[PDB]
Amino acid sequence: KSQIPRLSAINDLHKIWPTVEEHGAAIIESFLSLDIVRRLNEEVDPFVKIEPIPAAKTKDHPNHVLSTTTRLVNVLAPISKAYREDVLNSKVLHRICSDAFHVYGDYWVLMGAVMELAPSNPAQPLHRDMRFSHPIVEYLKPDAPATSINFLVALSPFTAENGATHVILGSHKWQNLSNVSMDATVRALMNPGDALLITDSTIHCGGAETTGTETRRLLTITMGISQLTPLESNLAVPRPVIESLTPLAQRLLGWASQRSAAPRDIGLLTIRGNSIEKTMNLKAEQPL
Amino acid sequence: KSQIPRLSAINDLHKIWPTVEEHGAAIIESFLSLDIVRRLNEEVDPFVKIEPIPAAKTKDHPNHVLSTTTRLVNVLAPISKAYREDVLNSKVLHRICSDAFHVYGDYWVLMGAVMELAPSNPAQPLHRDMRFSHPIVEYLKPDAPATSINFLVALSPFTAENGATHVILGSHKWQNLSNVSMDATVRALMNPGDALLITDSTIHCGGAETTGTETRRLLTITMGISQLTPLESNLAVPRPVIESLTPLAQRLLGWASQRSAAPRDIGLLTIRGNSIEKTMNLKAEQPL
Numbered sequence: 001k002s003q004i005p006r007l008s009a010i011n012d013l014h015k016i017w018p019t020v021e022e023h024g025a026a027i028i029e030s031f032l033s034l035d036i037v038r039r040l041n042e043e044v045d046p047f048v049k050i051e052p053i054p055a056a057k058t059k060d061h062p063n064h065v066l067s068t069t070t071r072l073v074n075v076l077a078p079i080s081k082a083y084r085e086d087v088l089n090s091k092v093l094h095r096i097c098s099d100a101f102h103v104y105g106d107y108w109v110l111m112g113a114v115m116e117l118a119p120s121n122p123a124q125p126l127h128r129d130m131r132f133s134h135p136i137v138e139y140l141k142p143d144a145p146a147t148s149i150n151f152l153v154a155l156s157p158f159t160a161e162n163g164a165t166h167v168i169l170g171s172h173k174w175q176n177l178s179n180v181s182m183d184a185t186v187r188a189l190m191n192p193g194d195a196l197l198i199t200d201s202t203i204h205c206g207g208a209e210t211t212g213t214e215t216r217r218l219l220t221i222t223m224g225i226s227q228l229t230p231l232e233s234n235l236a237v238p239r240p241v242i243e244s245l246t247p248l249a250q251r252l253l254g255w256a257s258q259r260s261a262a263p264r265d266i267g268l269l270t271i272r273g274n275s276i277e278k279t280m281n282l283k284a285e286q287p288l
Numbered sequence: 289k290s291q292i293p294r295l296s297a298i299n300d301l302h303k304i305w306p307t308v309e310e311h312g313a314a315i316i317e318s319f320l321s322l323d324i325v326r327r328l329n330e331e332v333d334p335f336v337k338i339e340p341i342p343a344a345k346t347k348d349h350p351n352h353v354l355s356t357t358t359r360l361v362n363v364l365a366p367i368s369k370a371y372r373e374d375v376l377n378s379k380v381l382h383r384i385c386s387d388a389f390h391v392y393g394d395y396w397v398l399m400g401a402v403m404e405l406a407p408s409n410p411a412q413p414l415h416r417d418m419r420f421s422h423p424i425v426e427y428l429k430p431d432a433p434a435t436s437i438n439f440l441v442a443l444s445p446f447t448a449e450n451g452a453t454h455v456i457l458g459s460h461k462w463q464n465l466s467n468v469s470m471d472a473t474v475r476a477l478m479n480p481g482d483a484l485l486i487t488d489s490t491i492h493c494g495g496a497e498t499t500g501t502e503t504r505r506l507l508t509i510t511m512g513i514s515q516l517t518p519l520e521s522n523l524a525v526p527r528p529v530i531e532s533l534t535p536l537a538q539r540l541l542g543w544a545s546q547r548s549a550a551p552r553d554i555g556l557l558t559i560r561g562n563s564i565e566k567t568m569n570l571k572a573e574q575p576l
């Protein structure tokens with residue numbers, strides 16, 4: 001069976017979205033440099049260690065789906081200079097997103113999360129993303145352009161033995177799911193900084209950790225049209241942090257108004273015909 | 289031809305959403321009391337008078353669709369005690385919205401706007417709402433439950449002569465629009481405080497103002513699932529104003545996390561498994 005197409009971040013940029021449109025998945029080699037991976041890992045390290053179980057009794061939005069041994073840290077902008085500067089301004093991410101979402105209009109981060117999978121973490125059931133947050137997506141026409149995509153960035157090696165992601169190629173176009181089986185999957189074997197790009201219709205799962213020794217870490221960036229509500233809020237991020245960002249990064253975090261692709265678009269998150277950023281006199285690129 | 293069904297806010301509450309599901313429109317008699325209408329009118333009056341043309345050159349999100357003589361004022365919470373207290377906590381509005389949106393989950397305000405139509409304002413072309421802001425809605429399956437509804441509340445008399453709304457009954461179920469004609473419409477004749485309730489698929493239009501003397505005013509409340517991005521932002525509303533509101537009103541303005549109807553919902557606008565309101569220690573019902 002066909003392996004996941006592998007593309008250059010550097011050379012093949014125009015080919016990435018077309019590849020995912022056709023196959024439902026592509027591996028972007030060196031999506032992030034090892035330097036950015038090192039910085040992001042160092043910055044999020046302590047937040048992963050203090051993070052309670054996904055369904056902790058102290059949480060008012062517990063995640064009952066993730067393995068109890070899994071750790072998920074989102075709202076990364078206040079945690080990680082590497083995330084809010086390098087990742088939110090990624091030339092490769094923005095080319096792919098504008099290619100993917102041009103029919104709809106502006107896009108933003110639905111969730112940027114570091115996930116750490118514990119040794120012996122079981123395989124996730126085969127699934128499509130967004131079904132625990134956005135019931136609306138199941139009501140879209142079968143041939144509706146993808147309204148979200150997910151960059152699964154390796155922050156540690158992804159191997160067959162340590163639970164590298166499974167995908168079913170072509171499954172983003174499936175209506176009948178009677179053929180859904182682990183028999184139909186191929187693996188995203190990845191070095192740190194490689195990214196597996198899938199759509200919200202690609203059938204996939206986290207793999208089984210079978211070594212009982214290896215901790216696997218990823219940065220999952222769900223990018224979606226600005227018409228869909230993010231899984232995460234940046235409302236509590238300090239204004240000085242927001243004002244250190246590029247206007248583009250501010251938009252991705254919901255600290256800007258948003259535009260649809262409608263010819264006479266009237267906009268999203270506006271204030272009497274003016275933008276958030278104009279109304280609030282929101283500064284940009286002010287160092288901390 | 290059949291007239292728009294008229295229902296009691298007081299007695300018929302369980303019948304309102306079923307009526308709109310069947311017919312695409314219903315008139316809710318005395319949706320708002322005359323006292324609430326009087327207060328809301330007095331509170332928004334000066335903001336309507338200072339409001340520039342919809343496509344003013346000073347605006348970075350101009351509205352090129354509305355008549356140049358029309359005035360639209362949104363983000364009403366900071367302007368209007370009557371809006372943020374009485375209207376956002378309306379028992380009738382919340383029963384209808386929970387009836388309409390239960391398949392999807394939480395709902396919030398996509399836009400609360402006062403519109404003032406000038407004497408001699410022309411009829412709007414027959415349309416469905418949301419097509420200048422949410423291209424996604426056109427990609428929903430034909431039988432997808434409505435993801436937004438619009439309360440068109442009369443703040444002045446709606447008469448045939450002064451441009452009372454037109455609706456095509458049953459048009460929320462239309463796929464083929466070859467029968468779209470003003471010949472197919474009936475009128476929402478309404479007293480101040482009556483509301484015309486339509487869905488995002490009901491074909492309708494503002495009527496022609498033919499007297500050349502009458503100014504018509506309405507409060508349009510587009511309620512939508514929390515999975516869809518509002519047309520307007522409350523991000524610049526002062527925290528003391530937000531903290532004066534009920535927890536429900538805070539949720540409607542996007543100053544709370546949101547839940548989907550998914551059995552193991554993981555939520556919207558959360559912060560590492562906790563709500564906005566828990567994270568920010570957001571107080572409620574603190575008088576100004």
Ligand SMILES: COc1ccc(/C=C2/C(=O)Nc3ccccc3C(=O)N2C)cc1
Nearest residue numbers: 065066067124125127129130131132220
């Ligand atoms: C154990 O099996 C699983 C675990 C997760 C999912 C899927 C999701 C989801 O749809 N969205 C995201 C997106 C990014 C990161 C996490 C999640 C997440 O938390 N869940 C629940 C399915 C199956």
Ligand SMILES: COc1ccc(/C=C2/C(=O)Nc3ccccc3C(=O)N2C)cc1
Nearest residue numbers: 353354355412413415417418419420508
């Ligand atoms: C002159 O003809 C028109 C004028 C308006 C619309 C429709 C919209 C719309 O879809 N959404 C809303 C919702 C509430 C209030 C205003 C609007 C609005 O601004 N427009 C543009 C159509 C036709």
Ligand SMILES: [Br-]
Nearest residue numbers: 066067070124
């Ligand atoms: Br997991």
Ligand SMILES: [Br-]
Nearest residue numbers: 165205206207
């Ligand atoms: Br994974």
Ligand SMILES: [Br-]
Nearest residue numbers: 354355358412
């Ligand atoms: Br108009």
Ligand SMILES: [Br-]
Nearest residue numbers: 453493494495
């Ligand atoms: Br109207």
Ligand SMILES: [Cl-]
Nearest residue numbers: 055056057058
């Ligand atoms: Cl616990």
Ligand SMILES: [Cl-]
Nearest residue numbers: 343344345346
């Ligand atoms: Cl002007």
Ligand SMILES: [K+]
Nearest residue numbers: 125126127128
């Ligand atoms: K699942």
Ligand SMILES: [K+]
Nearest residue numbers: 413414415416
């Ligand atoms: K129109």
Ligand code: NI
Nearest residue numbers: 127128129204
């Ligand atoms: Ni997944």
Ligand code: NI
Nearest residue numbers: 415416417492
């Ligand atoms: Ni309309």
